[model samples]
Target: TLHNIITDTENVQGSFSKHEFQAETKKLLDIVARSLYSEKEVFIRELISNGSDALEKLRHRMITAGGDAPMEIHLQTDSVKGTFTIQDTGVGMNKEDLVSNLGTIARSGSKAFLDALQNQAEASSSIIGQFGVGFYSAFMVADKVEVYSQSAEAPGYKWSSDGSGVFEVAEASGVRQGTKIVLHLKDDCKEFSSEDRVKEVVTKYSNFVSFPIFLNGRRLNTLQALWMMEPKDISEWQHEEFYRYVAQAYDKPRYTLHYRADAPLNIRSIFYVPEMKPSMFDSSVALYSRKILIQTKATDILPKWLRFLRGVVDSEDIPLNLSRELLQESALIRKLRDVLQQRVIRFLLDQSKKDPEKYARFFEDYGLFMREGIVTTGEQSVKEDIAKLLRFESSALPAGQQTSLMEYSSRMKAGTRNIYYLCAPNRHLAEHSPYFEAMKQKDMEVLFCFEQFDELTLLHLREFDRKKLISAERLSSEQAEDLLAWMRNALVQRVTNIKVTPLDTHPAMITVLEMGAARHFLRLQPTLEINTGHDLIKKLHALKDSNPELAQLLLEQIYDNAMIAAGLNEDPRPMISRLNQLLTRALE
Candidate 1:
């Protein structure tokens, strides 16, 4: 009878059976606490960050559903109790929420709230708790944790956990409108319970949090997260304040790109081009997930070329992989980097479009960084994309007015496969250059590059917008065989191929496969392109019949002059006397 009774009780109890959380969850807490850098102080930041998010979530809810509550994160550190207390005045949780949200550490409560609400407004999605479920980071320094919460629409509840195996949730009285988490610091983690230490941690990490933060009843976070706010809603004064704080310089930002994008990744960024020039400017742009600072100087956030950009990048898509100091290497982080970089490029281009005078000034100050951006990158496609921002003095534009490849391409003669450019000392020299003079008859626009690096940059670029970029200098002609032959015979290997070329101004110029590359090549052999129509060649030819001695001197002088003009000849001293002999004959 007892065996039958036991069987019947087992059958009846099966309907009411409950499955407990696995003991394996105990290791996850240990792993999270001890593994993420093993730094005990970060728990202050973790707790403050979660408090800020809870306030933001309530911020969005109040906007749509309509309610009122103070949005603030308050912290009090006690040495006597060796405890840390944090209170947030905004969205809280009920008994059911505390149980479900605290017990299931794998998923984020923030995501679930946003997902089910279907509110796509930037305010809702901008809530900060999406990356790595930062709330669990509190367990790193806490021996025991307790949360007293009260949601506006629900009753108060208390949630407590030792971060061991199981947690307890019970009805709470006198709970505030938002969450108040108390962390009992471990013996080794008492640093987190010190007022100075707590303040230091909060200011270092959560200073830019959306909500105000208080430590020991005194406001700690005064600087708002300007990057999180919509660009249209921000003021110039606000940006100025933020830039000074982040950049730590008295000079204002010369160029500010406040960018927000939702597609590739949810990116809210503010990039500042410093007014003091990059020399005096601090070059590190801080990194943030939501609003919490991940790394003070995230070198990997943008390419090394963009090191001059000063500000913050706040994206929910990026997760802190192992620690706050190091950004994770993932396909997603790479995509975020690329997307932010591309956006910055476009923003600078747009600034140039909006105000040419200002942008021209900016280009003069910061063009080196842009040029560096092109040369250092590996991908051809990326290099070309960066090259679009380059500005050069064009034959079509006036001396001082510069033009970009995009602008130059518009002026290009139809059906031309070549984008011509020329390197010279200045606009005056470029205009008077024999090589430039040779390009006059071609009837196409040539970009006039003035500096050595400008030429080198384009040389590396090679091609952009599906057209080959070539530096100014070439041509061919026939029926001048005798002249070419005589010059070849006289010089003997000095001229690799002495050929007549169609030209109006230049008497002679060097020929090369790629002019810019040759300039950058730092080496070359020879091919002399002689302009038959010019008087110098005609005089030399006639002098050969009259005075063979003068003919040879004239030939050598012409070659030397062309070499000097081609930027090939460094020492002109050797041919100095030959010019005097020719002058004496001319005077006679």
Candidate 2:
């Protein structure tokens, strides 16, 4: 007989000792049915993923350590009884392992793996199963989940959980090597107990699983972890086929990155960028661990701001339950996440260098994440790392040619420690900007930032390297004061604060609030730039002295102009009216 912590046992039939789960297991079970899984049929995907993981583990041990025999996952469904049975011929659990792994709730193997990997933190990527929750997702649709497992070295054990708080365990004989999970589906979810339903779920979620998957004695997962294979041996068509199947997408891949690394924790994954831009409503990509689909929209696995990115990230370091509910708090999971983020940064940097034009296309579609990263993350190093991939219009690059921060820094003027940038809609308007007039005078190279979040990200971002990434709207104290007095005297009542300063490039620039604070105040800061060199600035100043009423009218026009530049003014119709007023006043 094996005790609760027994490691090795032969074969013995024993009785149960009743114990309730530490937490409210019944309430937990209800949540599983009602909220844990979006669809009850997810049970099949979970079981298939579990079976695949076991087979993978056994096979890996055979190849690397040569400690385990050949193993496989077998499924036998009883549609009549509404019961689905999945069996694995892998490293089976002993009586104690079964009691500890299955009898208790939230006792996960991944957590142990995580602790071991943390000693050498760099290798934490491979420690999957941190939460020990995935296995419990089985209860989402099952009235009863029964398990029979025999240890590779010793005896067999049987465990049962009935969607209640308490579970029971005892010793049993006649069990084969590895584990078997038999799910007796509830009345509402009996559909998954069907042969066809199981096949559909596997096809959708686990088709490209590394190991063989079977449904009612039929082989389902035929494709290997082709992403982990050598890039040369895999063909273009194979990649397209795998991407289509994994993405459940129709279009071919625009870019694919497939590689496996052993250092940062065993990670094997394939990521793809589908060629066609998805409809705004589509939520397609899924997250996986050891080839098991964890979440269709895996938000936590990556930064929430990067939700637009569509792909799978599989690492063994993630925690899961018997039912597949992921544990989010494990250090191993965080480590894996950090490593993957670094990998993504590396991948993008490589792509940017390999073919800047093609990378530009990707950036145009998904650049919002980079902007969000710049705004959301506070770490200076990380912000700068993300900024390295930023592309902006510059005097150096052709109108269409985009340059990076690294490129911009290389061309910085002598004694210039700040990277200056201006937000505008287009190059034509930016060149005509009063802010640009000052910049042109100073011979300063300003990055033309057009996106709405451009200034927001840069403002939120601290120094990139030695130089601070400051918006042109944020001026030095001298510039802020000099511009304020002139605007206040010019039009006292109409103007709020003439605190905004003109840039060296653009001549007659209107001053508003600080670019960062004002950016927060008005969706668009009220900073208007008028070219002093332009005929309008000279005419307006001349008009200011003679007819105060007409000059006030022009001041109103300037306010509107500032709003337009700030992207706050929505109506071009009012601008047309103001333009008419200015033209009519000038002629009169």
Candidate 3:
């Protein structure tokens, strides 16, 4: 069939030249075939990108010399015939351009345009083709590829190759002043010739290709590049629409940020927080370069904790590797990550101050992500920056009221040296906690950490704003060595240390070697602090001299009660019999 088509063509001239490729046969085929080094579907993206680049060049020319032809890209599929075609109404290449650009590897027409625009300040943002091998990527999926082009200044020409070391060039008649590429799909790659499959590839990768893209007479790229538009120009409705399209969600956006920056890596991004609560399995945000989607769920663009954000980020200055399939994990990428993280944190902080009620609702749903950011990041400054957005129910605030650490620190009592926290299952339990009762008597505020991961997050944070993070459960005891000796001997298996504390009501509270770490790791052998001011401890102190057996049983029960309150005891069934016996004695 290939021989028949080459021989039966009407406009072929008598003289035709067979030119050898620039590189060796085996090496060149291997390079172009594995060049992109990613999904085979990316060959479609590369070919479409080349077509878009050609159209952009023609559009620039039309600025001075107008033309009537519509500047667009069209794709046609013929699955039965095993053919896929991409035609563009753009600056077509002459014989010379084809020989230099297509025959040779790493020779690009856009490179000339880039050299001419070297004096311009924003040259890189306008053009997408920096790598020259995008055109040859078609060979990765095709057995034979054909290029039909008619330059504006020269006659029509056809370039055909099997991606081997040899190719043929001949003049043809009745050709349009544009480029048409036809790829005879290999047997394994026949799926590309299906109309629906071609459209999907186009929509996934080249959806924002600077010009209209149509496949089988149906338009594909209808969504605009909203990230590049001004934030003031974007309406709430527009943001909702764009968010639904990019995030593939039905809900509207609770928060939208259309951020643009020039100095540091030329970023244009639009991030959205979904109105609905995010699941743990929700996809990460997409990454783009010059409006073309490069990664569907880009993990390296932002930190892993920010995976909850759903939207688009396009940067012209990302250092892409040779395949363009992977990005460089260089210092530039880290800087970009840091910059975007700080901006997002600052934005949330600003929103919190503007409307505390609305922000509290967001925190209720997505606050775990902020806590993850604090625990994952190793840098102290970055951890503290994320900590600014953390919200907690404080003893000083009412039942439902939440306060930030900044607000808590501002109201700290004079001469206070540490930030105090108490972890519990709920507000009622937290308020009634022996640890909280001790701090309550001192007129001190303790942050109530109720979530499962809250203890782990604070353990990693260690301290904030030069103040040590100390738990209320870790309070020091006074000089009551005699009582401590009696208590430790009574519950030697349970209590690490026993000491006396000044508390008005509670009998005793548990203190760990590292309270935060102990809570996180579920390991608790606590130092028991007996409230010397309480009547129960005084009774125990008196009974220790006479009824030592009752004192020992009471001490064991007290330790079990403190363990239950600390959330360290997984099962309290073992202590039920002893607690029943104590209850019977009390009733008697």
* The candidate that achieves the highest TM-score relative to the unseen native structure: 3
lDDT at 262 for candidate 2? Answer: 69
- lDDT of all predictions: 0.78, 0.68, 0.81
- Over 4 Å off, model 3: 1-25, 118-124, 280-282, 441-443, 474-588
Candidate 2: worst 10 consecutive residues by lDDT?
A: 122-131
Residues 1-588, candidate 1: write the lDDT tens digits.
345534434334345667886756778777766787646677677777677778877877877788765788888989999999999987888777777777776567886776666556765655655545456776787889999999888378889888888888888888979899998888988887789988888878878777777888898888888887778998898888899989887889988998888866677888998887755542489888867777788867698888889998877766666566576677877887888788888888889899999999988888888888888888899898888788889888687888889887777677777888888655544665557767878954678887558877987898898888877552125335556677888888666766665758878886554454455545445678887778877777677778888888888888888878866676899887878888897786
- What tens digits encode model 3's per-residue C-alpha lDDT throughout 452-554? 7888788899989878887765222532456767666666675677766664557877666544446455634566777776777766777677777677677
Candidate 1, residue 342: the lDDT equals 85
**Best model number under lDDT:** 3
Clashing pairs in 1: none
lDDT for 83 in candidate 2 is 88
Deviation in Å, model 1, residue 280 alpha carbon: 8.9
RMSD of each: 10.9, 11.9, 11.6
